[PDB]
Amino acid sequence: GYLTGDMKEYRIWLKDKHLALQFIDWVLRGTAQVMFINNPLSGLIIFIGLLIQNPWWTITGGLGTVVSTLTALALGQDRSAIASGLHGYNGMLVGLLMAVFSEKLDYYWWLLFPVTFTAMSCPVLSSALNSIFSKWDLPVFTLPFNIAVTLYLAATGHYNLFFPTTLVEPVSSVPNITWTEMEMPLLLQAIPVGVGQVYGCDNPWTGGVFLVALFISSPLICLHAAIGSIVGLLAALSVATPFETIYTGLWSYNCVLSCIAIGGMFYALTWQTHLLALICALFCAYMEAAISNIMSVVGVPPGTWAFCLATIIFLLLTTNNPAIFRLPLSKVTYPEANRIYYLTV
Amino acid sequence: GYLTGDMKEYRIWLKDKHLALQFIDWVLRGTAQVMFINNPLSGLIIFIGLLIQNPWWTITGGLGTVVSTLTALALGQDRSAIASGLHGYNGMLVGLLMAVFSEKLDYYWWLLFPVTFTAMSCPVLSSALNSIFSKWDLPVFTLPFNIAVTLYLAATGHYNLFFPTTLVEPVSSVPNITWTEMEMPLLLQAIPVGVGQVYGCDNPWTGGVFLVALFISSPLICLHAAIGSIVGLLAALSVATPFETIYTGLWSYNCVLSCIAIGGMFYALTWQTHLLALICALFCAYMEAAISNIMSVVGVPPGTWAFCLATIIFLLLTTNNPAIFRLPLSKVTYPEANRIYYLTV
Amino acid sequence: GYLTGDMKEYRIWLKDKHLALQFIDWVLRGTAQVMFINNPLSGLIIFIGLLIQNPWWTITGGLGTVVSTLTALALGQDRSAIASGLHGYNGMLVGLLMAVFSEKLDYYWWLLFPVTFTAMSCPVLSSALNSIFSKWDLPVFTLPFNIAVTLYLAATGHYNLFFPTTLVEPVSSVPNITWTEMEMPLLLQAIPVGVGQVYGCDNPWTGGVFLVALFISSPLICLHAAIGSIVGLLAALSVATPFETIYTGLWSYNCVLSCIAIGGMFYALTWQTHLLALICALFCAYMEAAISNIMSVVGVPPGTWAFCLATIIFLLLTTNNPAIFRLPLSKVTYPEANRIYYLTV
Secondary structure, eight states: OOSSTTOHHHHHHHTTSOHHHHHHHHHHHHHHGGGTOOOHHHHHHHHHHHHHHOHHHHHHHHHHHHHHHHHHHHTTOOHHHHHTTTTTHHHHHHHHHHHHTBSSOTTOGGGHHHHHHHHHHHHHHHHHHHHHHGGGTOOOOSHHHHHHHHHHHHHHOTTOSSSOBOOOOOOOSOOOOOTTOOOHHHHHHHHHHHHHGGGTOOOHHHHHHHHHHHHHHOHHHHHHHHHHHHHHHHHHHHTTOOHHHHHTTTTTHHHHHHHHIIIIISBOOOHHHHHHHHHHHHHHHHHHHHHHHHHHTTTOOOTTHHHHHHHHHHHHOOOSOTTSOBOOGGGOSOHHHHHHHHHHO | OOSSTTOHHHHHHHTTSOHHHHHHHHHHHHHHGGGTOOOHHHHHHHHHHHHHHOHHHHHHHHHHHHHHHHHHHHTTOOHHHHHTTTTTHHHHHHHHHHHHTBSSOTTOGGGHHHHHHHHHHHHHHHHHHHHHHGGGTOOOOSHHHHHHHHHHHHHHOTTOSSSOBOOOOOOOSOOOOOTTOOOHHHHHHHHHHHHHGGGTOOOHHHHHHHHHHHHHHOHHHHHHHHHHHHHHHHHHHHTTOOHHHHHTTTTTHHHHHHHHIIIIISBOOOHHHHHHHHHHHHHHHHHHHHHHHHHHTTTOOOTTHHHHHHHHHHHHOOOSOTTSOBOOGGGOSOHHHHHHHHHHO | OOSSTTOHHHHHHHTTSOHHHHHHHHHHHHHHGGGTOOOHHHHHHHHHHHHHHOHHHHHHHHHHHHHHHHHHHHTTOOHHHHHTTTTTHHHHHHHHHHHHTBSSOTTOGGGHHHHHHHHHHHHHHHHHHHHHHGGGTOOOOSHHHHHHHHHHHHHHOTTOSSSOBOOOOOOOSOOOOOTTOOOHHHHHHHHHHHHHGGGTOOOHHHHHHHHHHHHHHOHHHHHHHHHHHHHHHHHHHHTTOOHHHHHTTTTTHHHHHHHHIIIIISBOOOHHHHHHHHHHHHHHHHHHHHHHHHHHTTTOOOTTHHHHHHHHHHHHOOOSOTTSOBOOGGGOSOHHHHHHHHHHO
């Protein structure tokens, strides 16, 4: 009861504790907000999952979250936004994905020097983007992280002496796909892996832990994450993706985020909105294939550009349907509360 | 008399017929609206020209138009916009150009599965873009088609197993141009071919049929299309393009669209506006060369990005000249009526 | 006294002289406005520095400035903006950098044909961009020049028969950096060279002359230019750039412009704003590395994209700090006057 939703009672009870405890809560909420979850217990569970995946990635992501939150505080950003973790998840992703795409080994402590720096740009970028997107009542989903990490990975590249990144290359030959070597266990495993890849994690246990963290806050978010992962796998099979690429969940995490966002988070959860979420996730999968192919030419990973663009497109979509209701950004908490608010409206 | 303009009398007489006839009219108007023509007879003539070029391309383009119109209806878009074909031409182009840039043979029926899908995204995109561009009173020229087809051709690419696209590669050597092998007949033929390449068609007869379709609705549109084709050829000669590339009309169709749009369609046709149309077409030709070179690196055709960007730039241009008059978007029908409205104003 | 600032007394005394003298003043002010200086004496000193660097580049840049100013006059742009040189510096940069990146020899007079043309697009672009950026009270820093020159250099490319550009290629191997061959004299020389590279000039004397021109108008602008150059060099050393690349000042000029803009020009000069300028210059250096690496894939020089993007981001940044004050665009003259205005406010 006190653990589900966004833990409003815990927020009230902590708004008068020590500043260190409040900062820890903001960091946990920022960790959870990567998947639109404003829950500190979910953030703790996600931290446990990341520790299961890679403790070094956990260190880099936690440092990114801390630095992003501290920079948002120093820049005088909205304290309500900071307290809900809306200024820590972009830095979390920045740290995690500069650890993931580093050609150096684990515990390359020098990588903390760039991480911090490009975690400091995440609040700035957010602010700048909020100067534009607020004029359309749009969120800045992961555009700060995407901009920052794309710029970092292009600036360093694979041949940097200090911070070399992993080699990303375009596809140059037709894959050999024989449909009799499909492994149903691996295809099923790609659903939790697809969920976990929103944090850059390929461990199936990490993805299952992330699903548990999603369910703790909002069961509808967990359901839409699983459905988005499945939609991503189906799209990958539809355009004849090699099975090895499908198994890694790199075709699903953008669709996971898109299905979470459109299906109940920023639209009111109705069956029309659920169908819109499915269509947005499919279009996001194909746009992710396109963006990955385009950005592999300059040697940069696709990130979550496709999720941001597809979700922005489907939020800017205007229909005369009363059942497709876009909630005001200030009223958006989580799909159950969003549906209740929509019913009252 | 009843066949010229936008056939307002026919629209009035059909607004009370069967829904199937109205849908056929909307599809024909969407076919014609690729070249800013809101005329069903012009759409029928364009369909005849496409049948002359390639019946398979006709099938794919017609399916794209039908799917785009049906998706716009299902999404509750403005019925006035749907009835004028403003939600069918982007899907028409999507179907036509995914047929054109398919490495498979003609009548590869499986290509209808992707076509439909990315024809369904054309209304959505339009809506999303209209949420922004309406704040500047701008049209969404072919940005839905350009976004959708660029994403599709990047997602599949040349090495896709199911839907391989044609190989697009950057230029890697200096062309050998000897100016004594210029063929004046082929240079002249490149004018109707340049007009026809707005639909992806390289048949000169198809381009002539398209010019007839333009003339049926508005002689000024036909004149500006021919002048834009000539301007594109002159620009191609100006930057020393190989004659083989010039003959294909790939340097002219963007300029055709830009000259139509700026010269009388969205500006009031005056001599100052005609000069502005010429300058916009020239800048569009050079921007098209730039965009084609840039996008060949990722293996994607240039599309009509240059026309959209150049026309948006020249519409956003603000001058103190009273003779350069930008008509309100709701008053834009065709250059003759636009000039009459401007004279009354 | 009459030579510092923006020479308001000279502007008043010249507003009633011959039109040729006024046009010469506008051209000189446009030359100076590349570095945010609205001073004709500074423009003359910059012209002297360019003559020191390369008289052919001086010819191309002067022609670009003249053509841009004349096109702005013909298009009926704001006479106050034209008289302050705000419509001549983009054309100046266009001419200078199409001369710099030309694979032909000096005094290739045919290069004046493209220069003029893409100097005519600089006002248009500015106008178009001002239709958007004015809605956020933002300047169009060098986006007209960046768009125009990127399009030109992509359209022609290295293999053009008439106007071949220099070969720009991505890095394909790890540099061999031995830190014992650092030359302190060359590292120090890279500061004035970094300042001079805003005009594409690598002569250290040209950069020193540019610093003198900056100091004549505003000592704070000169100080921030030097500090931005130093910040660019420090960033280049931070990401292990080969010393040969560092010595050319190609890592500093974007940071020079960013430090000038944020540190006193469009923000009120306080110590908080000076720190913000340092951070913006650092982020601009890294974004410049990223953009250069990305655009070398399509064979295009980075230009000043990074400066424009970083400065726009840091201007759109919203803080609750009263000491970080964004001046209204109409009140922006130069850092000393800006600080006085901020103190009165």
